[PDB]
Amino acid sequence: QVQLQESGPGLVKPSDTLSLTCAVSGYPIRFGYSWHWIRQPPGKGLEWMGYIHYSGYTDFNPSLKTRITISRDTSKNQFSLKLSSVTAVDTAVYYCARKDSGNYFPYWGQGTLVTVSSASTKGPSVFPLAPSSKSTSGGTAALGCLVKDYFPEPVTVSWNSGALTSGVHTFPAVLQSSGLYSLSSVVTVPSSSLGTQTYICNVNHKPSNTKVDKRVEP
């Protein structure tokens, strides 16, 4: 029943220091299993960084070493990660886990993303896409929100505050020529439902602390 969640800055300039903290709930680190940090770059394999024993013992992976330090704050039930002299390679999602025993990790964190760029943060604009004009057809139609010009990733989109989750496709972002991420999230609904049912996209952006909601109408 142990749960782990990682939180920290979304973006870090190169040649700086990466700092992350994993929060454990339902079990005190001071007793029991040792706790680890694992990272995974986009579209690549998992890499094991190191761990901290309940005892306060710490050991690291030989590669990436001299940049990595792991510490904990038992009072807050937390164990933190620090990476220094960060480059573009260090851009990855970071995981919290539990060594458990026999060196297999049964419990993983939600995972947080960190991207290494000198660029500043925005600032997404949310534009609605208009559903099909054929309401007489009675068949399935599709609408969606357009999320454009934000940095960095990720952004979270939900429909009707999580009430509508079926038939929803949120495309992975792509880097525009402007240097800003952009994506579209669409959902298919019965054409007959358009008049009676209202559809709203719930867009949220953590780095720029932006929260935009948009109604979709013909």
């Binding site: 050991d59 599709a142 495309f171 669409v186």
Partner: protein
């Protein structure tokens, strides 16, 4: 550092069929080997405790076997939900390492893309930039062709495409192509069209709007 090597690195299988993945190790790891399942945008999931011990929640279809240098994970019957990438990692010795990963794609019977086209928002026209998107809803295989026509003129270099991961339920891909134009150039034209070419389609399908 012990190095694990998985095979195949990529795999495409038909539903309800046997799936096998091998994990060879630099040094004999004896009993100590584990298997993980990682669906997109999610944390890896424990499939198999050391050797082949099931995990408390993993279906009977999922299994495993091995000792020494060689280990094999087997999926007795491939299901729609199984669409993910699988990693093997060793627990014998520090530093801990993971496999190269094995992506498994479900080969479902061919289906035609449902195509929709969206005009740029009036709120976006004020910005001075116009974005037109063409939607290719659910379609297998992933291979597809999108052509943008402005007043029956082929456009190039102004379109960007995004493809989603395989669906957990229907195992179908989805594609979105975005056409970006300035308001100045957007309004010096009348007809905008999206041309889709897929295996499911007998002939290329074009969805267009005016004004």
């Amino acid at each position: 550092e012990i190095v694990l090597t998985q095979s195949p690195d990529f795999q495409s299988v038909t539903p309800k069929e046997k799936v096998t993945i091998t994990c060879r190790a630099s040094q004999s790891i004896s009993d100590h080997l584990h298997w993980y399942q990682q669906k997109p945008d999610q944390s890896p999931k424990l499939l198999i405790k050391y050797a082949s011990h099931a995990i408390s929640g993993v279906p009977s279809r999922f299994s495993g076997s091995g000792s020494g240098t060689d280990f094999t994970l087997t999926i007795n019957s491939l299901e729609a939900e199984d669409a993910a990438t699988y990693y093997c990692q060793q627990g014998y010795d520090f530093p801990l390492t993971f496999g190269g990963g094995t992506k498994v794609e479900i080969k479902r019977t061919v289906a035609a893309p449902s195509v929709f086209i969206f005009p740029p928002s009036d709120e976006q026209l004020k910005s001075g930039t116009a974005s037109v998107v063409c939607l290719l809803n659910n379609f297998y295989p992933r291979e597809a062709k999108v052509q943008w026509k402005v007043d029956n003129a082929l456009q190039s270099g102004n379109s960007q495409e995004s493809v989603t991961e395989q669906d957990s339920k229907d195992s179908t891909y989805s594609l979105s192509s975005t056409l970006t134009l300035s308001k100045a150039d957007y309004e010096k034209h009348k007809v905008y069209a999206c041309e889709v070419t897929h295996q499911g389609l007998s002939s290329p399908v074009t969805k267009s709007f005016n004004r």
